[PDB]
């Protein structure tokens, strides 16, 4: 998320925008996922669990 600062715009606002962009990307989450190797089976199980949760 390459972010540039506009004229007539505060630093805090820019920071907030950057944060939003990051959130949109889901980079941190991806990193977390990749931090340790996941077995395919485990991933599948997780997905299934998520699907189950979705149903309410």
């Amino acid at each position: 998320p390459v972010i540039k600062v506009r004229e007539n715009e505060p630093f805090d606002v820019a920071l907030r925008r950057f944060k939003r962009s990051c959130e949109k990307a889901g980079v941190l989450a991806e990193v977390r996922r990749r931090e340790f190797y996941e077995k395919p089976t485990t991933e599948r199980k997780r997905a299934k669990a998520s699907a189950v949760k979705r149903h309410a």
Binding site: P1, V2, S21, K24, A25
Partner: protein, 65 residues
């Protein structure tokens, strides 16, 4: 809401840059069918087109490189 269905097209081409850029984010990452409201085959086609563009370096893999 699916635009492709509304249009009534056979194939989504990698030629049209303006349509493809609407379906990816700024960083160079594809937007899901669940958010956009697209049909699945159409979504797949779109993805393929995006990939082709990336290969040809029409739309980037990553925005920082």
């Amino acid at each position: 809401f699916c635009r492709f269905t509304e249009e009534g097209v056979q194939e989504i081409d990698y030629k049209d840059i303006a349509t493809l850029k609407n379906y990816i984010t700024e960083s160079g990452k594809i937007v899901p069918s669940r958010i956009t409201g697209t049909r699945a085959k159409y979504q797949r086609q779109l993805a393929r087109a995006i990939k082709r563009a990336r290969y040809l370096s029409l739309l980037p893999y990553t925005d920082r490189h």
